[PDB]
């Protein structure tokens with residue numbers, strides 16, 4: 258899969274994008290890779306933050322579906338017109354597919370100034386597509402129309418401009434040059450988000466000792482479309498307390514722990530060893546087994562280059578509070594080669610050949626850990642009448 262290696266780019270904190278083409282002849286756009294959503298949606302009108310957009314009128318193969326789509330979310334929205342057109346990934350498989358495309362005609366706090374992406378590739382399942390689960394997501398169309406195996410994998414690699422990032426999205430396979438050591442699999446609990454189950458959490462080898470359902474309240478997901486590691490309120494508080502204790506030689510302002518303020522050291526003198534490792538134990542394929550993924554402060558402290566003191570190394574705390582469950586975002590994924598094995602309803606983790614580390618510690622993937630009479634750590638989301646009333650033909 259050499260032709261797919263290094264096909265992702267982006268700016269730190271602003272998402273990873275892949276080059277895609279839409280229409281006939283091919284119109285190149287940079288598209289955010291988002292395992293936390295399920296629509297293929299592209300800028301299709303002028304916007305202050307867009308240098309270019311999908312020009313439907315320039316495409317001989319474009320078909321209008323005569324249906325609108327409205328997608329509000331926490332502090333943002335995009336909306337537009339549904340249609341289909343021919344789509345390819347120049348540095349992906351050598352195929353062209355007819356996919357659903359949402360042509361974004363209006364948006365609020367969706368596009369990001371300087372991110373260099375013009376659309377989003379929702380790689381999650383039909384259940385969370387908009388307007389409804391009948392709108393076939395891109396990857397579903399790719400698999401159905403081609404011989405491409407039902408699997409993709411992601412290797413996300415971490416003074417005037419933001420730091421550039423890079424990585425790889427391997428479509429249809431696993432590239433063994435992108436990882437070292439063992440590849441460990443956790444079940445996809447349900448096909449909507451890429452939902453998984455966390456059975457144990459340790460901070461510097463110390464168990465948080467919470468009921469494991471707290472770790473997955475109200476879900477735990479793997480999301481390339483989230484920057485941070487996001488933790489449920491109770492878990493976040495316990496984690497911050499533990500990380501504070503380990504790093505107590507340094508007294509940071511409350512702003513830092515809230516992700517609202519940078520902390521700095523003189524170039525190259527960052528005391529990495531005072532910040533603890535964080536281990537998340539994920540449910541194994543075998544009932545009473547788990548494996549752990551361990552990440553370093555190099556992952557959860559994001560470098561942000563300052564203009565006022567460019568001689569210092571400055572960092573944002575990239576663990577944040579959630580009210581919608583655990584989110585293993587770019588913070589987690591940057592340590593690992595992550596395999597979204599849809600065919601076998603599982604997610605694989607292995608140590609990434611590109612992750613940032615020092616000479617004393619490394620990001621790790623270790624197992625098995627077996628537990629006698631293991632509890633059910635999954636949370637069951639209360640069923641609303643709205644949801645219950647849906648018919649699923």
Ligand SMILES: CN1C(=O)[C@]2(N=C1N)c1cc(-c3cccnc3F)ccc1O[C@]1(C)CCCO[C@H]12
Pocket residue numbers: 270271272273289291292293294328329330367377480481482483484
């Ligand atoms: C959590 N999350 C989002 O907020 C989201 N995708 C995910 N997964 C998302 C993330 C980013 C982003 C911004 C900065 C860095 N990285 C990104 F992915 C940009 C847009 C965006 O829009 C949605 C697709 C619209 C529907 C709800 O989800 C959104």
Ligand code: NI
Pocket residue numbers: 648650
């Ligand atoms: Ni019915």
